[PDB]
Structures are given as C-alpha cells and as structure tokens.
C-alpha cells in the first residue's frame, strides 16, 4: 500500500543548511539520543549517509509537562507551498445536529512520508539523523498534512452525504441526525478509515460527549461559546517563545480584530539562537498588552438551521459604534460590531456596516442574509440616487430602531431668488503658514478673518464656513475650490476636523443652500474681489 | 504537441486569493470541475504548486468564469491579440458567441500547466480548498485563442469565402459574427457557424442602432450670470482635454456682476467666443484621434442629473462619450447597475475598436471587487482601477446628447 511522496525543492539558487551544531549538557545528549532512538525505530528517523554535508540545530527544552530542531533555516531556502486552508469553521455556521463527535488525529505528521530527495536536507547532529516523514516545523508540513487530510476525507464524505465532516488542522468534527447507535457506528467507519491509512485516533483525542471542545470553542448542544484565548506569561522569552506565541496570535487573529504580531515578530531578527533571550521593545511590550486585552473576551451564539431565514439587523449605538446580529427569526446565530474610522455621514457608514456583514455572511453561510437598516427607504434611496459614487445593497428593510439614520440637507439645485450671494476664498503664505479668509456678497459686504499656521484648503474651508454664518435661512455660496465644493456635495454628518464640524453645524440651521464653484483667477464678477481681498499680504 | 510558454523576465505566477461565494455557486464549480477533470481538461494541483488564480461563476445553470488577468500581464508575448475590420460597426446586426469549450482540444505545455492553479472555496471553511490546474488551453488566457488559431483557421477560412458578406472575427473568448443579412438569413449564417464548432451562450448587438452622442453647450434664450458661471466651469474643464477652448470673453460678460439672477449684456466677442466653441467641440469630436499603441480606457461617471455616462479616452485624449437612459426601478443595487454599464461600454468597444478598455469606476475597490461577480454575464474581464468623480465633471457630462 505506497503512494509516493511529493517532490519538494529549495528556492533556485540556494542550497540546505549546514549550520553550527552548539553543545549542550551530558544529561540533554542523553534524553536526546533516546527520543532519537525511539523515532529511528519507529521510522521517523533514519541515519544519514556519510556524504550529507547538511545540518541543522539540535535543541532540548524542559518538558512543557523534549528535543527541537531549528528548521528556521531550512524553512527559509525551501520552496513556498500553497496556504490550502486560511479561514476558521465558525459554529454559527454549523448546521443544527443530532449527534456531534470531536476526534483528534496523532501524530499525524508521523504518518506522512517524507520524499526521499529531500530527506537530506533535513540532517541534524547528536550520531547524525535524517527525517522519513514530515518534520515538525518544517515549512511544507502543514500544508503537506492539510491536503493528505482532504484526500483521506473526501471518500469517506461522498460515502455519507449525510454527515457533515469539518476538518481543520488535526480536528475533525463529525455531527449527523442518525440515531445514536447509527452516528456511533459511522464515526467507528471514519476512525477504520484513518487507522488503515495509518492515522492513529487516540481515546483520549476523541470525544463523545458535551461540551465538546473544539479549536477555541466549546460546543453545548444547544449554543457555542468562545471561550476567552489565555495567552502565555514567562519570565524570560526565548526565540521559539515568541514563535509559539506568534503562532496562536495568528489563529486568534481570525476570530477577533485587533490583534497584531509585527513589533513581536522583530524581536526574533533571525539568526539568534532558538534559546537565545529576547530583547524587549516598548512597541513589542505594547502589542502583547493590547492582545491579551482583545482575546480576554468571550462570545457566544447559536447554530444555523439552513431552512430558515437568514437576517441581519442594524443599530447605531453611541457616536462611531454600530452594532448588528445575524439571526434567524429570534434566534441569534452571532452579534458583530463595527466602529472603523474624515468625513462621511450615517448613510454612508452604514453601507460599509453592511458591506461588512454581507462578506461575513457569504464566508459563513454561504448566503446573504436579509438587512433590517435604522434607515427609511425614501431617504436611503434618494440619497444613493444622487450619490457620485455606487455601493452594495441587497434586499433589505426599514426597522424603527432608535436612532434612525437621517439626512438632513437642503442643498438645491438652483439660486435661491432673493438670498444674499456670497463669494468665498482662502489663501496661505507658503513659507509662513499665515493665511486669510473671507468672503464679498452682491449685497455690498465682505469680511476677512486672519490665519496662521493654516493651509490653502482650511483656509478655503474656514470661508466657507464664514458665509453660512453671517447669511440668514437661504444663501446662495460661490467658491472656487472643487474641494470644498466636493466635501459640501458629500454632505457630511460627522468630522474629525474643527472647520468642518462648524460648517456641518451651520449648514443644518439653513432652509436652502445653493452652491456652486467657478475657476479662479478668471476675472470673475464677486470671485475676482475675494480673491484680492483675502490674497492681499499673503 | 504543445508549444513552449514563457513568463516575462523576472516575473513569476500569480499568488491571488478565492473570493468567498454563494453555495450554490460553489456546488455549480465543483461540478463543473468534476466533469473537467473527467475528461482530462484539469487535474489536481499538488501542496507544492503555490500560485493561485481567482475563480468565480456567472449564470439557468453556471459557467466557469476565472479571473486570468494576472497571469496574462505576465505571461511573455501574445500581445498583437488585445487586428480589427472597421466595416464591423456599420454592419447591421453582430452576434457574439462564448468559443471557449473548444479551446479543450488543445494540450497546454506541461511546464506552464503550473501557474492556472485556482481554488474552490467551501462554505464555512467547513474543508480545505479544492485546487486545480489546468491540461489543456484555458479559457480566459491570452494565450489560448492563439494557440487555437490553426484549429479555428481550418474552419473560418473555408465558410468564410462561402460568405464574403459577413465579418467572423474572434477576440479573446468570443466570436463575433456580424452581417447585413435579413435575420433569418443571419440567424442562418450563425446556426450553420455553431455547427462547423460543434464538430449557446452569447449575445446579440445592433451596431447601427446605436446613436451617437456628443458634448454640446447649453443654448439658452436668457442667459443669466449664473447660467455664464456654469457655461465657463464647464468650458474650463473642456479646455484640459480639447485644444482652442477659451473662456475670456464670456469670462468678461460676467466681471462686473454678482447677483446670480442677473441677466448678461451679450458682446460680439463672447458670442463669436461662444460660437467658436460650438464648432471647436462639435469639429474635434469628428475627429480620429485612436493609437493601438496606447492604452484604450474608459471612465464612469454620473450625470449631476444622476444619469450613467462615460468616456472613451486615451489619457486626455476623448475618443467617445456615451449616455444611459434613467433608470425607473428606485431600489436598484449600485453595483449591479455600475456592472451593467460597464459590460454595456466594453461591447460597445469590441466592435468600434477591437478591444476592452481599462475602466476607471466610480466605487470602492473593497465593494467592488466583492460583488462585481453577482452580476456579470460576459467571459471578459477588464482591468480596472477605482476613482472619485469631481462634481464639475458631473455638470460637464450633463452636456452629452443627441
């Protein structure tokens, strides 16, 4: 029964390792030599030729309850695999079942044999050894594994259509609406499957009843529960401690935001030795700090029943917090949030809220749901109608959850017969950021206002601003920079800018506000007079 | 045997990410590349291959639609293939088929097969993705339709002298058959072509049908000191892009006023100004101003009036300008209506200039590249970046009509 391993090759132009081996202590050479023993026997290991030039650093570490070579060089020369599986199964998006089952694969890179050509660059020193299978830490392991896991699968799927079957690493779950007896009997099937393809299924890594745990998660069989991620806290951090450390943060990064692994990941700077002490940074301090908060969460929900409806539900809490559920009917499958961060207004920030939701959606359910929006159609639609730009919107409806999405503008697409006119215009010193703004009215007045450390948009835009303050209810404004005249059109509800909240605040007192640009410099009947009055000793 | 591919100097395989996509979508590619692979069109892509190209599917069953545009760009040669009968436009009716089946006859060099890996996602990550590589000539690649040629040749250039009337060119994955027949004597012309294939999915166009449009000024019977701000603001934007605009003199009807409701004292000056832009537009948007050797590309854009217009341009250089009718249904999808246009325009290019342009589209990159899928129809895909749209340039494309 021999399937031949894949071929494997180092990136052109680079050769295997042939690092330093460091000695250590006659106790560690001792359990080293007999783990090595052990996986020679076995058939994991096997003695290198006399002729291989190869070797890579042989390290043993105080049982976490021994021995670890630093591939991190072979790792780095080895070709680049394909990433077969990046995205979590999420319970919520696991159907409703009878009967689940949890089991745990052993060993499971034991099992995989390694191709012969590449065997030799896989030489350590203790005796020198060569891998037969798949080496743990070896860069093309995991995906090696993840695609001979599929393979086994599959057969045993298109066998029971039925049943579903979710693997992700070496955890495989296995939930059914056979009987109890039936659903036992086919997870026996699986467990003969596996062990004749010689993928043992320890007792110990299968689990027959509730909660079942499940990468993270713990599985009642009513709902699911995140349970809070606890990540490590030692004293002294060692390279192959951060990278441990790295590898869950990497996980966990999928089931929240926030998390990120940069400054941690520049405190091994390669070529230290995988013992060696690492030397804290105030940025790398921070990350972890800013993590273990993140993941000190917990979150919970319930399971999806695919011939339900799937809805989704929207509500704006205080400034920048949007929150929303994904359910079916009153059940909850899960609750999101969503407060990413110029000048945009509700409208527009709930479109991204829905964009969020439906990518969400589409990777866990593989459907999009339906939207109920704080938002009344009238005004949802009128306002994309008129939009520049375009956006994602499925079927959706109107909810009465408090507060609604308003917009309130009373920009119109004429003059207004009888408002006042005002021309409006700002200009900065170049070199020393002093600048003026004002405006001149075809009712005889004109105002400037002295600037500093301004620029030639806030200068425009602190006119602007001028003229709906000193005009009444209607007021027809001309300007000559498309940049205000853009950010008026988006008519923004929220800023982060000062100018631009005040203008947010005077255009909502006034009626009617037309608004429209001319170019600069052109001679311009009332833009001309600004211009020379606000550029005068700027 | 199978000619040798090269990609270009110091490029390598496309590494791209799978879209997540509907269940059915799914189901629909897992089927198809089931039978593919049956029939020995694809096979299974090793954990060794790490590139990856994106897949999607249009609709009814499903087609296989894969996003090579990436490997296109790098792979070395076939050009001169993105040649074109200028009759084509003038011709009365032109059908468009999707060829691409036939392009499974032919083997692909086993050293390229490599870089046409693709993925298909599952729900819920429930299992790895399921990849794939390709055998045989892909649709979609650039290089297909060339290396089909000699295959296509013996076919077209018999049943085309027995048709010296009507024009059968093929761009990309299509095949264009346009002629002047009455329809049954067209649809006659096309069942026969099928048949000649076969030894389905594509579309119909009525060239001549089309109307041209153009920029044109406002004409007015009272024109006020506002209607002169928004004639030069347009006037200014026209400048950038047509040579001898100018705006002095209507400039100067306006220099002494400021109340918007005010009508203008004409001069001889602004109108002969006036006019002179009326025939430098209407003269200049007659012209020829195409180079195959630059980049065809094409802007979207809404009206102030929220119609859908656009550009046909070359850098600066407007070659065509085009307007959409209003749409009635209120609650339409922004995305599919922007996804219909686009697919609107690039048939509309095929024919005038033998190729697809490269679209500037007025959405966010994020949304767009999520969604576009759901409503597209075509085996094309363009290339396409993401811009903002001026409000001026909103007034300015107010202007095309006709």
Not at chain 1, 92 to 121: M, N, Q, W
Request: proline share 6%; charged share 30%; glycine share 6%.
């Amino acid at each position: 029964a021999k399937v031949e391993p894949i071929k494997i090759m180092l990136k052109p132009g680079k050769d295997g390792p042939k690092l330093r081996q460091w000695p250590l202590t006659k106790e560690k050479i001792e359990a080293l030599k007999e783990i090595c023993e052990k996986m020679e026997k076995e058939g994991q290991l096997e003695e290198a030729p006399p002729t291989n030039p190869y070797n890579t650093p042989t390290f043993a570490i105080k049982k976490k309850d021994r021995m670890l070579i630093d591939f991190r060089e072979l790792n780095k020369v080895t070709q680049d695999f394909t990433e077969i599986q990046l995205g979590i199964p999420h319970p919520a998006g696991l159907a409703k079942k009878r009967r689940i089952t949890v089991l745990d694969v052993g060993d499971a890179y034991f099992s995989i044999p390694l191709h012969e050509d590449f065997r030799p660059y896989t030489a350590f020193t203790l005796k020198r050894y060569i891998y037969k299978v798949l080496p743990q830490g070896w860069k093309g392991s995991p995906a090696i594994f993840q695609h001979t896991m599929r393979q086994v699968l599959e057969p045993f799927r298109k066998a029971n259509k039925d049943v579903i079957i979710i693997q992700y690493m070496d955890d495989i779950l296995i939930a059914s609406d056979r009987t109890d007896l039936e659903h036992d009997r086919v997870v026996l099937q699986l467990k003969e499957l596996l062990n004749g393809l010689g993928f043992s299924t320890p007792d110990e890594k299968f689990q027959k009843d509730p909660p079942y745990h499940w990468m993270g998660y713990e599985l009642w069989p009513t709902k699911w529960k995140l349970q809070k991620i606890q990540l490590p806290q030692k004293e002294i951090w060692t390279v192959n401690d951060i990278q441990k450390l790295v590898g869950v943060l990497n996980w966990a990064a999928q089931l929240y935001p926030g998390i990120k692994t940069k400054h941690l990941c520049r405190l091994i700077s390669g070529k230290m030795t995988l013992t060696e002490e690492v030397q804290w940074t105030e940025l790398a301090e921070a990350e972890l700090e800013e993590n273990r908060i993140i993941l000190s969460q917990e979150q919970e929900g319930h399971y999806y029943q695919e011939e339900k409806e799937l809805e989704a539900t929207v509500q704006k809490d205080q400034d920048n917090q949007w929150t929303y559920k994904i359910h079916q009917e009153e059940k909850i499958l899960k609750v999101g949030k969503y407060a990413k961060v110029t000048h945009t207004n509700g409208i527009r920030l709930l479109a991204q809220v829905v964009q969020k939701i439906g990518k969400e959606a589409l990777v866990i359910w593989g459907r999009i749901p339906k939207f109920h929006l704080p938002v009344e159609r009238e005004i949802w639609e009128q306002w994309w109608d008129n939009y520049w730009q375009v956006t994602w919107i499925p079927d959706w409806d109107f909810v009465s959850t408090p507060p609604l999405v308003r917009l309130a503008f009373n920009l119109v697409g004429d003059p207004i017969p009888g408002a006042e006119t005002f021309y409006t215009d700002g200009s900065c010193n170049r070199q020393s950021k002093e600048g003026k703004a004002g405006y001149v009215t075809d009712r005889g007045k004109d105002k400037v206002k002295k600037l500093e450390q301004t620029t030639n948009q806030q200068a425009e835009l602190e006119a602007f601003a001028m003229a709906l303050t000193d005009s009444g209810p209607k007021v027809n404004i001309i300007v000559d920079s498309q940049y205000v005249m853009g950010i008026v059109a988006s008519q923004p509800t929220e800023s982060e800018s000062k100018i631009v909240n005040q203008i947010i605040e005077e255009m909502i007192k006034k009626e009617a506000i037309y608004v429209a640009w001319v170019p600069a410099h052109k001679g311009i009947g009332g833009n001309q007079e600004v211009d020379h009055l606000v550029s005068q000793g700027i | 045997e199978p000619i040798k591919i090269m990609l270009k100097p110091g490029k390598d395989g496309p590494k791209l990410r799978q879209w997540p996509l509907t269940k059915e979508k799914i189901e629909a590619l897992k089927e198809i590349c089931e039978k593919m692979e049956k029939e020995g069109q694809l096979e299974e892509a090793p954990p060794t291959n790490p590139y990856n190209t994106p897949t999607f599917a249009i609709k009814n069953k499903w087609r296989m639609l894969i996003d090579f545009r990436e490997l296109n760009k790098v792979t070395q040669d076939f050009t001169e293939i993105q040649p074109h009968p200028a009759g084509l436009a003038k011709k009365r009716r032109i059908t468009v088929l999707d060829v691409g089946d036939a392009y499974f006859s032919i083997p692909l060099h086993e050293d390229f097969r490599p870089y046409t890996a693709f993925t298909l996602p599952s729900v819920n990550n429930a299992e790895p993705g399921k990849r794939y590589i390709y055998k045989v000539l892909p649709q979609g690649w650039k290089g297909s339709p060339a290396i089909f040629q000699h295959t296509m040749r013996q076919v077209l250039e018999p049943f085309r002298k027995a048709n010296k009337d009507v024009i059968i060119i093929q761009y990309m994955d299509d095949i264009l058959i346009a002629s002047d027949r009455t329809d049954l004597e067209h649809d006659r012309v096309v069942l026969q072509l099928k048949e000649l294939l076969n030894g389905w999915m594509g579309y119909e166009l009525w060239p001549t049908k089309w109307k041209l449009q153009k920029i044109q000024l406002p004409q007015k019977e009272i024109w006020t000191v506002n209607d002169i701000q928004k004639l030069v603001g347009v006037l200014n934007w026209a400048a950038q892009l047509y040579p001898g605009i100018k705006t002095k003199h209507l400039c100067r009807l306006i220099s002494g006023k400021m109340t918007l409701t005010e009508e203008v004292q004409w001069t001889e000056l602004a109108e002969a100004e006036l006019e002179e832009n009326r025939i430098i537009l209407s003269q200049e948007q007659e012209g020829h101003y195409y180079q195959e050797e630059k980049e065809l590309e094409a802007t979207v854009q809404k009206d102030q009036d929220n119609q859908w217009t656009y550009k046909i341009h070359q850098e600066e250089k407007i070659l065509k300008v085009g307007k959409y009718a209003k749409v009635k249904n209120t609650h339409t999808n922004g995305i599919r209506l922007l996804a219909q246009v686009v697919q609107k325009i690039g048939k509309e290019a095929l024919v005038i200039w033998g190729r697809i342009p490269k679209f500037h589209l007025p959405v966010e990159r994020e949304i767009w590249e999520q969604w576009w899928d759901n409503y597209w129809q075509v085996t094309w895909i363009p290339d396409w970046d993401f811009v903002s749209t001026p409000p001026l340039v909103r007034l300015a494309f107010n202007l095309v009509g006709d």
